[PDB]
Structures are given as structure tokens and as C-alpha cells.
Design an enzyme around this catalytic site. Structure first.
Site, mmCIF file in Angstrom:
data_model
loop_
_atom_site.group_PDB
_atom_site.id
_atom_site.type_symbol
_atom_site.label_atom_id
_atom_site.label_comp_id
_atom_site.label_asym_id
_atom_site.label_seq_id
_atom_site.Cartn_x
_atom_site.Cartn_y
_atom_site.Cartn_z
ATOM 1 N N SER A 11 0.780 -1.237 0.000
ATOM 2 C CA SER A 11 0.000 0.000 0.000
ATOM 3 C C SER A 11 0.813 1.289 0.000
ATOM 4 C CB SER A 11 -0.931 -0.002 1.210
ATOM 5 O OG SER A 11 -0.177 -0.170 2.406
ATOM 6 N N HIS A 218 -1.123 6.113 6.490
ATOM 7 C CA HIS A 218 -0.551 6.114 5.148
ATOM 8 C C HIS A 218 -0.222 7.508 4.680
ATOM 9 C CE1 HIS A 218 -1.672 1.959 5.077
ATOM 10 N NE2 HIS A 218 -1.101 1.820 3.896
#
Length: 236
Positions: A11, A218
Site C-alpha cells: 500500500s 498512510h
């Protein structure tokens, strides 16, 4: 740029957190705002194969992502290992349970990072080289998640932030050593993100999400273009 560019990983390479996901990538959530796409657009490689996938573990890179690597590949980027060590489960535990539960879970993850992850990384790194003998391979590390400061809202307890940052340090240490062992470049994302962690006041990371897509911890679009991209530019 002579030769093909193949972007592998999880990711942090697909771009979860940067938005504008390409629907064709499904749950892999790759986006043109991710550093591999930004680099390819600016450098025009002979070919560009973006196969990073949200949630990928080392065995997934070996099973699903090796196809585009060949003798004409000149550049390979990779982020991998965080999910093998269960950091998503670690973060869920730290957010929803007690500080004690968080520490214990973090410690179990750190033990895996020291004893089991090195072998899996060697397996992935060796196979990448076998399929793409001539490529420059850049392995990028992960960012530290927190800036330790005066009481940060939602940012977890200091003890938990310290433990989590410590786990990132250990993970990055293992990755950097394995990369050097294979003659691969190590991208110091932790260094690039210093002063841009959660609670920093100028974060390039998403905080815990309670609604929407889970892009907790993230890189934001700014983190991808200002942090990851310059690191890849420096090593490509």
C-alpha cells in the site's frame, strides 16, 4: 530512462492515502498520485508496470508481482514487509485496546521482524534479481508514524507512540541491512518524513480513520510527492 521500470510492493507503493485510485486496480488501490506513477510520468521509462497492491505480503510479491521483471528492466522500486509482520493488526490493537495490550502486540511484531522477516525479504530480493539481472533496485523503507510531543489528541498515548516508532525503527533497520546485502539502494523514508509525522503539525500521514476508506497511517498525496518521490529520485 532506458529500460523498463517495474514498481512492486504494498500500500505504501500503490498509493493508499493519496486518493484518485484507479478503479481497474480494485482493492490493490494503485493511483497516479503514488510515487511510482509520478516518477514514470516525469522520467519516461521505456515501459512502466505498476503492480504494487494494498495489503501485499512477501509471498504476494513473489506470486503476483514478478511477471513484468525481465532482462530489459532497468529500475525496480519496492516497499514490502510491514504486512508480513502484521502491523495493520498491531495498529488495530493499539487503537482499540489498552496501552498494555498495544505494547505486548508490538513486541510480538518486533520479534517476528528480527527472527522471521529477514529470510522472507532475502527470498523476495533474490528472486527479483534473478528475473531482472540488470535493474537498479531501490527498496524504500517506511516512515515513523509519530512525532512525540505534548499531549496529542487521538494520537495515542506517549508510551504507545514510542513503542510503535520503535517497531518502525527495527523494521527499517532489517530492511536497510537486507537491501545493502543485495547491493540494492535503501530509500530512507523515515528521514524524509521527519517533521511530517502524525502530531508534527505538518503531517504527511493520515491519522486513524473512523469513517471512509481505511488509509490510517498512510502517506497523503503530499507525502507521496514530497517524501517518497524525492527519495526515489535520489536513488533511481
Amino acid at each position: 530512462a532506458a529500460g523498463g521500470y517495474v514498481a512492486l510492493g504494498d500500500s505504501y507503493s500503490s498509493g493508499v492515502g493519496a486518493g484518485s485510485y484507479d478503479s481497474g486496480s480494485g482493492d490493490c488501490r494503485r493511483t497516479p498520485k503514488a510515487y511510482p506513477a509520478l516518477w514514470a510520468a516525469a522520467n519516461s521509462p521505456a515501459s512502466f508496470d505498476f503492480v504494487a497492491c494494498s495489503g501485499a505480503v512477501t509471498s504476494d510479491v513473489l506470486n503476483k508481482q514478478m511477471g513484468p521483471l525481465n532482462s530489459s528492466t532497468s529500475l525496480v522500486s519496492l516497499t514490502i514487509g510491514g504486512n508480513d509482520a502484521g502491523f495493520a493488526d498491531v495498529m488495530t490493537t493499539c487503537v482499540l485496546q489498552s496501552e498494555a495490550n498495544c505494547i505486548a502486540r508490538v513486541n510480538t511484531a518486533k520479534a517476528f521482524v528480527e527472527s522471521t522477516l529477514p529470510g522472507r525479504l532475502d527470498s523476495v530480493y533474490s528472486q527479483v534479481r534473478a528475473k531482472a539481472p540488470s535493474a537498479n533496485v531501490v527498496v524504500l523503507g517506511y516512515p515513523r508514524f509519530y512525532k512525540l510531543n505534548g499531549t496529542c489528541v487521538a494520537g495515542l498515548t506517549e508510551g504507545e507512540r514510542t513503542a510503535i516508532n520503535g517497531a518502525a525503527d527495527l523494521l527499517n533497520s532489517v530492511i536497510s541491512k537486507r537491501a545493502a546485502d543485495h547491493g540494492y539502494a535503501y530509500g530512507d523514508i523515515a528521514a524524509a518524513f521527519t517533521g511530517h509525522e502524525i502530531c508534527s503539525g505538518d503531517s504527511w500521514l493520515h491519522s486513524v480513520k473512523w469513517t471512509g476508506i481505511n488509509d490510517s497511517y498512510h502517506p497523503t498525496a503530499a507525502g507521496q510527492s514530497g517524501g517518497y518521490l524525492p527519495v526515489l529520485n535520489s536513488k533511481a
